[PDB]
């Protein structure tokens, strides 16, 4: 009956930050507030002020001293809050968790409050390539706490404490409409055409759940289909100033099925995205990591019904492609959008330079 809490101490041991959670679920309309408590000894500083900062950054490069193009660190959101000396009571009152932490600690505890705006991306990370070293570009969240006489004062390693949090999303309860698509291709003069119908079973598939596609081919024409290919593609939409869409296949299934002219074909396939065979592909997007733990493929990013903003950070989306191989060109294909989420538990110069550099790298 005792809840857990996460804490991290300063290298000198004087400063410690208490956090009630590490994953802050987004509800598509509001974000769970970042409520915490900072413990500091007044006799230690006795003239400075305690500041806590929330930051989300589009970081590149590794964590330590890389020996190449280092961390382009465009910032998407910066917040500042003062713990000791205290500030006005809002917002709005102190929370229940803050009250319990104050009761557990005493007078030497000072709370802080942060409200994450809705217009922010989720924590993801591009998969590094074998030729590269360390990690690659990926947004992340961070909380810092330090003692200084002003906000512009330089950072101190002996007093500041750095903590890493995450922003996650979960599967909505309401099911979506049935995803289906069709595509017809006629010929030069004959009314004979090439009609195919493809559809999924659901909009939302949990991580690891197989995908069953329903493909119907109406080849009432003269040409012959040799191969059928079903692929699941991942779209990583890097957005800083100019949108860049990157395609990375994650699962492919091929069968040597022949479709005779003036005949139909029906079959149901089974394709499942997973990380075992995509451990060497550049440009793959994974879920944000805490320190170094293994993470699955990046969950789809779903936005509100009225799309006005959130063009920032990295956006992930999945689409299933079904392709028909036709002799002498005439390829016909369809794309079936779907989401992939976990179930709910119970004009700066160097910025343009970096954008061009990333575009040249991944493309």
């Amino acid at each position: 009956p005792g809840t857990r809490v996460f804490k991290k101490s300063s290298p000198n041991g004087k400063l410690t930050v208490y956090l009630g959670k590490r994953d802050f679920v987004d509800h598509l309309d509001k974000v769970d507030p970042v409520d915490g408590v900072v413990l500091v000894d007044p006799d230690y500083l006795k003239d400075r002020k305690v500041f806590v900062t929330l930051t989300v950054a589009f970081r590149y490069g590794r964590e330590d001293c890389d020996v190449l193009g280092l961390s382009f660190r465009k910032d998407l959101f910066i917040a500042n809050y003062q713990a000791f000396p205290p500030t006005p009571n809002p917002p709005r009152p102190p929370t229940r968790l803050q009250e319990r932490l104050l009761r557990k600690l005493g007078q030497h505890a000072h709370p802080f409050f942060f409200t994450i705006p809705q217009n922010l991306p989720s924590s993801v990370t591009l998969q590094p390539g074998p030729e590269d070293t360390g990690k690659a570009l990926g947004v992340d969240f961070e909380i810092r706490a330090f003692v200084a006489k002003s906000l512009e004062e330089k950072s101190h390693k002996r007093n500041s404490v750095r903590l890493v949090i995450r922003k996650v999303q979960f599967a909505p309860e309401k099911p979506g409409p049935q995803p289906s698509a069709e595509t017809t291709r006629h010929f030069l003069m004959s009314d004979r055409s090439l009609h195919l119908e493809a559809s999924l079973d659901k909009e939302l598939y949990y991580h690891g759940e197989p995908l069953n596609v329903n493909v119907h081919v109406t080849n009432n024409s003269t040409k012959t289909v040799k191969k059928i290919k079903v692929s699941v593609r991942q779209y990583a939409d890097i957005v800083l100033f100019s949108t860049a869409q990157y395609k990375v296949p994650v699962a492919q299934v091929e069968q040597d099925d022949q479709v005779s002219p003036s005949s139909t074909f029906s079959k149901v396939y089974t394709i499942t995205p997973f990380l075992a065979n995509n451990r060497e592909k550049r440009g793959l997007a994974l879920d944000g990591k805490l320190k170094h733990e293994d993470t699955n493929l990046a969950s789809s990013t779903i936005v509100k019904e009225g799309a006005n903003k959130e063009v920032l950070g990295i956006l992930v989306s999945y689409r299933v492609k079904v392709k028909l191989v036709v002799s002498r060109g005439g390829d016909v294909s369809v794309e079936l959008p779907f989401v992939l989420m976990h179930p709910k538990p119970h004009a700066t110069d160097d910025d343009i330079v970096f954008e061009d550099f990333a575009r040249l790298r991944l493309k």
Partner: antibody, heavy 119, light 109 residues
């Protein structure tokens, strides 16, 4: 959901034996299939595990280099291969199952196949 | 190294309707990765508690777990006449996972 397994019996010491666990009712990518053996009259013991999603296999220190675990995703089965069987390798082998996202204990078990080695 | 999971007592005797307490000791600190299984003689184990505090689905509410540092405890409020089996303590935070030594619960006369 059912965890049916077979393939045990009597194997001469130093021989080889192959155990199969035909999982049913769930998926091999969303679950991690573990193997647990129980010595007669003793407690449980962990020997091997496989994670089809990440392609990761782990083994116990007492069975490292002798036991090889593999799975066939198409048939939704897990295979444990025994090599260089010794008198300490006789037990009843179970086929557990734990959620991949995320681990919450071995909530599903098989029925156990008896394995003995004797000259 | 390997985390030894010392479980005591080895065997305890209790009567119907009494309270049964089993303690599990971890040599190294595991946060909450403790699971409690129940194995009747001749059958396969059955998960009862996961995360050292949560009750598994389809399990009577008399079973309950708790954590205190590295001391994990399984408590049964009312000992049902069919709850006489062997209980194990398993940790799954560090590979390899290590089980306990068992705690046989028998009727008292």
């Amino acid at each position: 959901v059912q965890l049916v397994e077979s393939g045990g019996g009597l194997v001469q010491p130093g021989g080889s034996l192959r155990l199969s666990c035909a999982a049913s009712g769930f998926n091999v990518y969303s679950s991690s299939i573990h193997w647990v053996r129980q010595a007669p009259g003793k407690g449980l013991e962990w020997v091997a595990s496989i994670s089809s999603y990440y392609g990761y296999t782990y083994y116990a220190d007492s069975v490292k280099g002798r036991f090889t675990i593999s799975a066939d995703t198409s048939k939704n089965t897990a295979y444990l291969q025994m090599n260089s069987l010794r008198a300490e390798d006789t037990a009843v082998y179970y086929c557990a199952r734990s959620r991949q996202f995320w681990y919450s204990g071995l909530d599903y078990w098989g029925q156990g196949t008896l394995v003995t080695v004797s000259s | 190294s390997d985390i030894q999971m010392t479980q005591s007592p080895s065997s305890l005797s209790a009567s119907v309707g009494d309270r049964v307490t089993i303690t599990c000791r971890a040599s190294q600190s595991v946060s909450s990765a403790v699971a409690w299984y129940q194995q009747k003689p001749g059958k396969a184990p059955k998960l009862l508690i996961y995360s050292a505090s949560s009750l598994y689905s389809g399990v009577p509410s008399r079973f309950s777990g708790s954590r205190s540092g590295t001391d994990f405890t399984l408590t049964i409020s009312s000992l049902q006449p069919e709850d006489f089996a062997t209980y194990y303590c398993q940790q799954y935070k560090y590979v390899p996972v290590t089980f306990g030594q068992g705690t046989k619960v028998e009727i008292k006369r």
